[PDB]
């Protein structure tokens, strides 16, 4: 039985392809035999050798069958068995074991471990196996993409030409997109189209993604991004039947694609869930777009969006960014087309709040280009009035986060100077902005040592407390938070 | 055994039928429905708890036939009313009617849905967690995704306007994320989607599953390995026997009992 | 800090007593045992020093009387329960030293008579704090079982069972002739560290926490703590004599007794001889801990989850213990849960780098021996462990001011005896001005929470690398006390 | 408000003309938020990623200098093939080319070793 | 080297790629591989640079037999750089750092007797300074 089963597994790995069902049946046989106690009691490690098997080949076959945890366990068992066999023979690091496995079996342990860990999707485990071929450009590019180092990824993608062309342009487009760089991406796509008429489907999908994200409505097995572009175009053209049909088709395709695969890891579900959330949000906003638009409906929609964003607090940035981008596109479309009765002021306020939230979220994940783009979009629709707003403070925070302290300090000082004369304890929101700006300026000046403590107390830290307290804008929840923060800063 | 065999034979006869119906086909269908109604009435009258294991499949088979023809709609409607409305007072059938999928939103099902909602909310209004638990408990019965088509819709309506309780559910499930209810619901929905592939009306089921999964975004579930639901009674019965041969006998007999209700005669 | 000297309208003691009385009024279940511990500081002699102690005792008595003015039943019931605990702890329990199956509690013990205590919650439970004054629907003690087990040790602590109002049993460990206040203080530190770790997204995503248990000191000499059910010491699992993992999996290697004998006989030798003997012992003694998760979780998914949880627990415990200078981390002071595969640290008497003052000083920041690394998988300390350590150290560095504040509050506690003394040093290692010290400990802690190691500023990754390379260094491991069991 | 000339802008222009680097940090009190001043500061400190992002973001800047700065930033970051494809796309989207763009095109052609392109400028 | 001096990290990578286009890694290592390791170190990617330098040292341990003076200078410089990097990153205990890298570089520079040169004196000075530090 041992020789015949080993022959079956090495024939599976020979490739002489075999059906997946036979491989799964033999894997089930091995898994069942793993859990049975042998007549000679021994230990649990002894129970894994009812047959004289080579567990590296079994692990490779299981990985081919998308049994990632089983493949990992079998690789561990094979490594342990090899170590004990060597210890018997004499009477080693991962690299030596990998070389021995490659020169006897043809499979290197390090590459199999890396593939299994990539399939599982646990981030930290990707750092455990890097002994061999870590200099290879594709591994370096994957590492750069994992850590969201888009500049290095772009440089390496452009430098290396031995990489296949399709994935090269895919990575270049992804890196350009993740750095902002929308107009550069559009011109690059136009040049790529000029230099080659033939286009692979992934490039077409990326082209549609860029088209719908950049708001260029002239482009006319449908992919997800093509469906999104068609739905947005139909929404602009007020053709609701095609809009709903496209959304339904995209939803069905996403669900079918997810359900075809064999699922073992939760990390394989997140992109599909994000896409389905985006589709659902677009469909929900469709009905609001169709009929008359009122302030209450927009406020309710924004409230539900904020609630679900709060629900998505611990999610990764790669799963939260597309939803925010679709929300921004939806708000811009609703502003530019449907509004003709001066109701666009409320939509402008909602869009400004959404962009401020997007800037905050992007700063939380150490991203400095998306906040700048959001601030530019805010400045496009909003003009600096006599009184300052929250988005100017957000811009100052963004500049501080970009390690440009002098410019942020200048912005905040100008804002405080304007507020000193503009406000007369009239607007509670303006008062909260004023006290928050005073506190932030005091903290920044204390951190940078650009002012002596006396001026810091007299002008900023005590002034914020005085403004928060004496103005008597009581009976609120935001005021209590601002007062707490000012008190804590002064106490510190 | 005889009751189960007769019920499943009639269910298999009904479930397969030509799209074009002649006089003889209509007569055969009417005869099958009359036999099923008579068997159900006799079983429920002679024994109260006889149909608690076959009620869900019978109802799921009878529901699609309501809006396919007018002549036979009367008979299936009367059978459904007798099964649900007439026997609402029976205590043995009360619990199994509690675990039934909601009827489709149509005028013909007005009284049936009124009675079903009255039975379901006897204790009181449900919270989001209770609704999800009810959906999961119902899901263990049938293997046809089509019967779930209405229920999924209701689930969506609960997920859209109860996110405040969803936050509390996520907060409560933080101690042991492995047994979290949201990841369990997502896995159940994915399995139901898998079972609907290559079946009649799969597109509507996929669309409903997609809407339900869109109501719950990429929430961090604090888990990595997906664990599939298992039968606790099966595990206890396995642990009853200590001999290997006895365990093998139990497994084989369970498989044979399960396959006794297949369509093929061989 | 309670006393009776600075009394008056604006006296410190008056305000402190008023605040303590108010806190006791609002939350009796969180403060009454603490007050009674000071009130009953010397009840062991009654049932069977300086002016500050007398003042504290009298103030505690005043607070107890004030509490009793509103809740007489609760006060009397808790006092009776504490007396029963102390009497049970003071029992000799020397004739049943060999017996392990279980010993019936003598009928004369009052603990066998206490039943249906509706006003007393189980002392060893973690009672959640509610902002409403009313405390309702809480599990309360209603019975005690008639038999008690014995925990292996020199002083023979007693393992008893308490059955509450919900009908489920809880195991408690009654200890006598030891100081349990230090353990409670360190548990408070661990709770504060857990709260700090919970509010960072990076460590909340990875579920990095410190396992904790409840300790209740009853007097200056006895106490009762929560027994961790479903846990086993790593030493008992690894180097047990008839069913240790090393014996079962590697019968041809050196036995644990042989390694211990070899290492004990080389103590009064040179460092090269110690090093060579240690290397020879390590050559014929290979780690077998990786099988712990292999024989308990046959499902690969559950096995992977448990291994990941074990690695994360090890990383978090190592970082937190290094920050607090925890010492005396031998195989019998660390437990592993048989269900979650997570580590629990007990016997936290030695902390704040007081283990380096011992005659055989401890030269490692934490325990990272070969078994601990082998339990992590083929990768070792290169994957999840290093990243989790870096995340925990970033969390500690980002909240340094709060940590200094907490440690400053603790180190000046008059009743916290954390400094090393010759008697404790002699007891710890047996083979078969305060202000300057506190200031120096605070200075060392402040240096630790920054990158200042050996006078140079280090990043989080560099500091983690230095700690890891110090923990696994064979020359460091060969120089420690044989009771620490470096080869294990 | 009396003469029509602001002292800060004149000082900044004089210091830019002189060319001393450190003196460029002394006068930044006013209009330092303006995109062109920020871009000049980024180019002075050789922060090419920030310069590229700001050049792409701001559209109110005149087109010729916008593409000139974009090409310079792409060149200084390496990015030769990306620069070539960007130039080809720019040529596709607009046939009319200003002389500075032609000179940059010749510079990229001779630096990238593409010998098919056939008041002559220095790079030409 | 010039691009690294001015805190530029893309031009050195492009230059290393151009070098690799015309040069293939032979049995013995060269100066450009050490330059690539230095570039990777300058890009704050310490693990990859350390792996490159360790592989290079492993190859040189068997490849060279005190034949080429330039190869000897490369070997001793690589040993010194690896020792300094390991000391900086605290990835090794001092005993191994002395025994394997810092003293080995001095031994290779001195005992091999490739004297009567100017580059050798510079390499010996650098190795002596590293060991003394
Ligand atoms: N909280 C606990 N939960 C479970 N087991 C415990 C707990 N505390 C102690 N033990 C076990 O009881 C054993 C006895 O330890 P202990 O009561 O501390 O006496 P000891 O070994 O002499 N230490 P010490 O009392 O300080 O001299 C330990 O080795 C553990 O196995
Ligand atoms: Mg102990």
Q: HEC string of chain A?
A: CHHHHHHHHHHHHHCCCCCHHHHHHHHHHHHHHHCCCCCCCCCCCHHHCCCCCCHHHHHHHHHHCCCHHHHHHHHHHHHHHHHHHHHHHHCCCHHHHHHHHHHHCCCCHHHHHHHHHHHHCCCHHHHCCCCCCCCCHHHHHHHHHHCCCHHHHHHHHHHCCCCCHHHHHHHHHHHHHHCCCHHHHHHHHHHHHHHCCCCCHHHHHHHHHHHHHHCCCCCCCCCHHHHHHHHHHHHHCCCHHHHHHHHHHHHHHHHHHHHHCCCCEHHHCHHHHHHHHHHHHHHHHHHHHHCCCCHHHHHHHHHHHHHHHHHCCCCCHHHHHHHHHHHHHHHHHHHHHHCCCCCHHHHHHHHHHHHHHHHHHHHHCCCCHHHHHHHHHHHHHCCCCCCCCHHHHHHHHHHHHCCCHHHHHHHHHHHHHHHHHHCCCCCHHHHHHHHHHHHHHHHHHHHHCCCCHHHHHHHHHHHHHHHHHHCCCCCCCHHHHHHHHHHHHHHC
Give the number of other Cβ atoms within 10 Å of residue C271's Cβ. 10
Does residue C347 line the site of ligand 1, with CB under 6 A? yes
Under 8 Å between Cβ of B25 and B65: no
Give the number of other Cβ atoms within 10 Å of residue E125's Cβ. 11
Give the number of other Cβ atoms within 10 Å of residue B38's Cβ. 11
Is D53 close to A184, i.e. CB distance below 8 A?
no
Give the number of other Cβ atoms within 10 Å of residue C456's Cβ. 9
3-state helix, strand, coil in chain D (%, to 5): 65, 0, 35
E12 CA: distance to closest CA in chain D (Å): 10
Q: Which two structure tokens, joined as six digits, stand for B250?
A: 């139990």
Under 8 Å between Cβ of A352 and A376: no
* Cα A49 to Cα D63: distance, rounded to the nearest angstrom: 72
Give the number of other Cβ atoms within 10 Å of residue B259's Cβ. 9
Q: Is B238 on the interface with A (CB under 8 A)?
A: no
| Residue of B217, B220, B229, B238 to mutate, testing the A interface (most A Cβ within 10 Å of its Cβ) | B217
Side-chain-facing half-sphere of A17: CA atoms under 13 Å: 3
Count of all residues that appear for chain E in the document: 133
Under 8 Å between Cβ of A460 and A417: no
**Please, what is the Cα angle at A134 between E38 and A154, to 5 degrees?**
75
* Cα C53 to Cα C50: distance, rounded to the nearest angstrom: 6
* Cα A59 to Cα C145: distance, rounded to the nearest angstrom: 52
Does residue C228 line the site of ligand 1, with CB under 6 A? yes
Residue recorded with tokens 């031009």: E11
* Cα A280 to Cα E56: distance, rounded to the nearest angstrom: 55
Taking the CA atoms of residue A5, residue A7, residue A12 and residue A18 in that order, the dihedral angle to the nearest 10 degrees is -80
| SS3 state of residue C191 | helix
* Cα C179 to Cα C204: distance, rounded to the nearest angstrom: 34
**Ramachandran angles phi, psi of A149, nearest 5°:** -100, 85
- Would you give the distance in Å from CA E124 to the centre of its chain? 13
Under 8 Å between Cβ of D24 and D15: yes
Experiment type = cryo-EM
Task: Identify the bridge partners of residue C337 per DSSP, sorted by sequence position.
Answer: C231
Helix (H) or strand (E) holding C139: none
* Cα C167 to Cα C388: distance, rounded to the nearest angstrom: 40
Residue C248 has its nearest CB partner, among A43, A75, A120, at A43
Widest CA span of chain C, in angstroms?
A: 77
Cα dihedral across residues B184, B190, B196, B201: positive or negative: positive
Residue recorded with tokens 């220095």: D122
Contacts of A402 in chain D (CB under 8 A): 50
Rg (CA), chain B: 20
B183, exposed or middle or buried, with CB in 10 Å at 0-12, 13-18, 19+? buried
**Ramachandran angles phi, psi of D13, nearest 5°:** -65, -45
Q: If interface means Cβ-Cβ distance under 8 Å, which residues of chain D face chain E?
A: 46, 77-80
Q: Kindly give the distance from the C-alpha atom of residue C152 to the centroid of ligand 2, in angstroms, as a whole number.
A: 10
E88 CA: distance to closest CA in chain C (Å): 8
Under 8 Å between Cβ of A396 and A375: no
Query: What are the Cα distances from residue B244, in Å, to A36, A352, B236, B249, C440?
Result: 10, 69, 15, 9, 66
Size of interface A-E (CB pairs under 8 A): 18
Cα dihedral across residues A103, A106, A107, A110: positive or negative: positive
| SS3 state of residue D84 | helix
Residue recorded with tokens 């998505």: A312
Contacts of A125 in chain C (CB under 8 A): 379, 383-384
* Cα E93 to Cα A320: distance, rounded to the nearest angstrom: 44
Ligand nearest to the CA of C350: 1
Picking from A46, A47, A48, A50, the residue whose alpha carbon sits closest to that of residue A59 is: A48
| SS3 state of residue C446 | helix
Size of interface A-C (CB pairs under 8 A): 61
Q: Which chain A residue's Cα is nearest to E40?
A: A135
Contacts of A183 in chain D (CB under 8 A): 56, 59
Picking from C316, C340, C470, B224, the residue whose alpha carbon sits closest to that of residue A125 is: B224
Which residues neighbour A312 within 8 Å (Cβ) at sequence distance 6 or greater?
Answer: A319, A320, A323, B217, B218, B219
**Ramachandran angles phi, psi of C233, nearest 5°:** -60, 145
**Ramachandran angles phi, psi of C380, nearest 5°:** 90, -125
Buried-state track A371-409, b at ≥16 Cβ within 10 A, e below 16? bbbbbbbbeeebeeeebbbbbbbbbbbbbbbbebeebbb
Task: Identify the bridge partners of residue C344 per DSSP, sorted by sequence position.
Answer: C335
Q: Which two structure tokens, joined as six digits, stand for C376?
A: 């992590």
Is A124 close to C382, i.e. CB distance below 8 A?
no
Is E13 close to A155, i.e. CB distance below 8 A?
yes
* Cα D97 to Cα C272: distance, rounded to the nearest angstrom: 79
Query: What are the Cα distances from residue C346, in Å, to C162, C211, C460?
Result: 22, 10, 28
Is B217 close to A252, i.e. CB distance below 8 A?
no
Does residue C159 line the site of ligand 1, with CB under 6 A? no
**Ramachandran angles phi, psi of C251, nearest 5°:** -65, -20
Under 8 Å between Cβ of B62 and B147: no
Task: Report long-range pairs for A211-215 (Cβ below 8 Å, ≥24 apart).
Answer: A212/A329, A213/A177, A213/A182, A213/A325, A213/A329, A214/A182, A214/A185, A214/A186, A215/A329, A215/A332, A215/A333
Give, for ligand 1, the residue of C335, C423, C428 to mutate: max count of ligand atoms closer than 8 Å to Cβ: C335
Residue C205 has its nearest CB partner, among B178, B220, B227, at B220
Does residue C53 line the site of ligand 1, with CB under 6 A? no
Under 8 Å between Cβ of A97 and A79: yes
Does residue C213 line the site of ligand 1, with CB under 6 A? yes
| SS3 state of residue C173 | strand
Is A188 close to D77, i.e. CB distance below 8 A?
no
Is E48 close to A135, i.e. CB distance below 8 A?
yes
Which residues neighbour B203 within 8 Å (Cβ) at sequence distance 6 or greater?
Answer: A252
Cα dihedral across residues E82, E87, E88, E90: positive or negative: positive
Under 8 Å between Cβ of C215 and C228: no
Under 8 Å between Cβ of A94 and E11: no
* Cα E3 to Cα D108: distance, rounded to the nearest angstrom: 20
* Cα A416 to Cα A431: distance, rounded to the nearest angstrom: 11
Picking from A50, A70, A64, the residue whose alpha carbon sits closest to that of residue A107 is: A64
Which residues neighbour B93 within 8 Å (Cβ) at sequence distance 6 or greater?
Answer: B44, B48, B49, B51, B52, B55, B87
**Please, what is the Cα angle at C138 between C136 and C141, to 5 degrees?**
135
* Cα D16 to Cα D35: distance, rounded to the nearest angstrom: 16
* Cα C401 to Cα A431: distance, rounded to the nearest angstrom: 30
Is E89 close to C462, i.e. CB distance below 8 A?
yes
């Amino acid at each position: 039985l041992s020789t015949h089963v080993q022959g079956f597994f090495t024939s599976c790995l020979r490739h002489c392809c075999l059906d997946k069902k036979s491989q799964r049946t033999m894997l089930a046989v091995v898994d069942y035999m793993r859990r049975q106690k042998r007549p000679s009691s021994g230990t649990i490690f002894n129970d894994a050798f009812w047959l004289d098997l080579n567990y590296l080949e079994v692990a490779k076959v299981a990985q081919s069958c998308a049994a990632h945890f089983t493949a990992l366990l079998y690789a561990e068992i094979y490594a342990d068995k090899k170590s004990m066999d060597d210890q018997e023979k004499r009477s080693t690091t991962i690299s030596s074991l990998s070389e021995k496995s490659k020169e006897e079996t043809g499979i290197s342990l390090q590459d199999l471990l890396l593939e299994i860990y990539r399939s599982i999707g646990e981030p930290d485990s990707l750092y455990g196996c890097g002994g061999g071929k870590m200099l290879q450009p594709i591994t370096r590019l994957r590492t750069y993409e994992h850590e969201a180092m888009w500049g290095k990824a772009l440089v390496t993608y452009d430098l290396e030409t031995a990489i296949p062309s399709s994935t090269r342009q895919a990575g270049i487009i992804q890196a350009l997109q993740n750095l902002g760089l929308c107009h550069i991406l559009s011109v690059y796509l136009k040049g790529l189209d000029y230099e080659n008429k033939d286009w692979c489907p992934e490039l077409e999908e990326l082209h549609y993604q860029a088209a719908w994200r950049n708001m260029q409505w002239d482009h006319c097995g449908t992919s997800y991004h093509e469906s999104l572009y068609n739905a947005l175009q139909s929404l602009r053209d007020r053709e609701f039947s095609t809009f709903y049909e496209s959304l339904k088709y995209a939803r069905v395709k996403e669900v079918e694609e997810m359900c075809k695969r064999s699922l073992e890891s939760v990390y394989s579900l997140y992109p599909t869930l994000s896409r389905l959330q985006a589709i659902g949000e677009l469909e929900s906003i469709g009905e609001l777009f169709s009929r008359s638009v009122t302030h209450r409906q927009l406020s309710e929609v924004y409230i539900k969006w904020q609630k679900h964003s709060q629900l998505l607090k611990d999610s990764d940035f790669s799963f939260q960014e597309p939803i925010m981008a679709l929300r921004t596109v939806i708000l811009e479309i609703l502003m530019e087309k449907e509004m003709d009765n001066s109701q666009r002021e409320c939509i402008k306020d909602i869009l400004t709040k959404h962009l401020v939230e997007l800037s905050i979220l992007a700063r939380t994940f150490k991203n400095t280009q998306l906040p700048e783009r959001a601030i530019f979009q805010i400045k496009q629709y909003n003009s600096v009035s006599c009184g300052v707003s929250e988005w100017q403070l957000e811009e100052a925070q963004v500049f501080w986060a970009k390690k440009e302290q002098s410019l942020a300090l200048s912005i905040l000082k100008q804002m405080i100077k304007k507020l000193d004369a503009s406000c007369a304890a009239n607007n509670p929101s303006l008062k909260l902005t004023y006290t928050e700006c005073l506190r932030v300026c005091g903290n920044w000046l204390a951190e940078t040592c650009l002012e002596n403590p006396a001026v810091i107390m007299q002008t900023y830290l005590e002034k914020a407390v005085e403004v928060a307290g004496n103005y008597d804008g009581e009976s609120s929840d935001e005021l209590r938070n601002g007062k707490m923060k000012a008190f804590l800063s002064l106490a510190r | 055994f005889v009751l189960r065999d007769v019920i499943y034979t009639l269910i298999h006869y009904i479930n397969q039928r030509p799209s074009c119906i002649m006089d003889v086909s209509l007569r055969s269908f009417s005869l099958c429905c009359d036999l099923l109604s008579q068997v159900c009435q006799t079983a429920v009258t002679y024994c109260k708890d006889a149909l608690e294991n076959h009620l869900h499949v019978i109802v799921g088979t009878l529901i699609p036939l309501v809006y396919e023809q007018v002549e036979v709609q009367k008979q299936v409607l009367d059978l459904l009313k007798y099964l649900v409305i007439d026997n609402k007072d029976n205590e043995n059938l009360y619990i199994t009617i509690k675990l039934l999928d909601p009827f489709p939103d149509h005028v013909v099902f007005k009284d049936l849905r009124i009675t079903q909602q009255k039975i379901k909310y006897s204790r009181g209004p449900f919270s989001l967690l209770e609704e999800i638990n009810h959906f999961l408990s119902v899901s263990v019965y049938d293997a046809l995704p089509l019967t779930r088509l209405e229920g999924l819709k209701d689930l969506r309506r609960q997920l859209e306007l109860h996110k405040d309780q969803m936050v509390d559910i996520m907060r409560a499930s933080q101690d042991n994320p492995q047994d979290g209810i949201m990841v369990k619901l997502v896995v159940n929905l994915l399995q139901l989607s898998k079972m609907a592939i290559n079946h009649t009306g799969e597109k509507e089921v996929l669309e409903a599953v997609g809407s339900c999964l869109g109501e719950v975004g990429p929430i961090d579930f604090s888990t990595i390995a997906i664990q599939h639901s298992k039968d606790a009674s099966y595990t206890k019965a396995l642990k009853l026997f200590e001999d290997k041969e006895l365990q093998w006998t139990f497994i084989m007999l369970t498989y044979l009992n399960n396959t006794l209700v297949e369509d093929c005669v061989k | 800090r309670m006393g009776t000297k600075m009394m008056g309208g604006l006296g410190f003691h008056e305000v402190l007593n008023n605040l303590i009385s108010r806190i006791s009024m609002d939350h009796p279940h969180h403060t009454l045992f603490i007050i009674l511990a000071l009130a009953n500081a010397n009840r062991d002699e009654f049932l069977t020093s300086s002016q500050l102690d007398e003042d504290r005792t009298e103030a505690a008595n005043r607070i107890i009387c004030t509490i009793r003015s509103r809740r007489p039943q609760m006060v009397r019931s808790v006092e009776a329960l504490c007396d029963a605990y102390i009497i049970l702890a003071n029992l000799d329990a020397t004739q049943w030293k060999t017996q392990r199956k279980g010993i019936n509690i003598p009928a004369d013990q009052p603990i066998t008579k206490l039943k249906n205590l509706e006003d007393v919650v189980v002392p060893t439970m973690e009672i959640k704090v509610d902002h409403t004054g009313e405390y309702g629907n809480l599990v309360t003690i209603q019975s005690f079982k008639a038999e008690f087990r014995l925990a292996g040790g020199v002083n023979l602590p007693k393992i008893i069972d308490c059955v509450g109002s919900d009908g489920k049993e809880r195991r408690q460990l009654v200890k006598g002739r030891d100081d349990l206040r230090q353990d409670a203080v360190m548990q408070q530190v661990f709770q504060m560290c857990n709260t700090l770790l919970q509010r960072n997204t990076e460590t909340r995503k990875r579920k990095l926490t410190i396992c904790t248990y409840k300790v209740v000191p009853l007097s200056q000499r006895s106490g009762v703590l929560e027994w961790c059910t479903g846990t086993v010491p790593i030493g008992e699992f690894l180097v047990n004599n008839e069913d240790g993992a090393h014996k079962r999996y590697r019968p041809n290697d050196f036995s644990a007794f042989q390694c211990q004998k070899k290492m004990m006989e080389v103590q009064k030798k040179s460092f090269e001889e110690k090093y060579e003997v240690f290397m020879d012992v390590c050559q014929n003694f290979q780690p077998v801990f990786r099988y712990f998760c292999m024989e308990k979780f046959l499902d690969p998914a559950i096995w992977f989850e448990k291994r990941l949880a074990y690695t994360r627990s090890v990383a978090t415990s190592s970082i937190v213990g290094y920050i607090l200078g925890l010492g005396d981390r031998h195989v019998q002071n660390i437990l592993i849960n048989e269900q979650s595969a997570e580590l629990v640290h007990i016997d936290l008497g030695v902390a704040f780098e007081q283990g380096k003052i011992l005659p055989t000083p401890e030269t490692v920041p934490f325990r990272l021996t070969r078994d601990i690394v082998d339990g992590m998988g083929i990768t070792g300390v290169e994957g999840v462990f290093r990243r989790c350590c870096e995340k925990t150290m970033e969390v500690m560095r980002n909240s340094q001011e709060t940590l200094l504040t907490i440690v400053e509050v603790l180190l000046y506690d008059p009743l916290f005896d954390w400094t090393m003394n010759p008697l404790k040093a002699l007891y710890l290692q047996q083979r078969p001005s305060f202000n300057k010290v506190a200031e120096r400990v605070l200075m060392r802690l402040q240096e630790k929470l920054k990158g200042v190691e050996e006078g140079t500023v280090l990043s989080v990754g560099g500091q983690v690398n230095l700690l890891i390379q110090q923990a696994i260094d064979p020359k460091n491991l060969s120089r420690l006390f044989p009771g620490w069991k470096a080869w294990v």
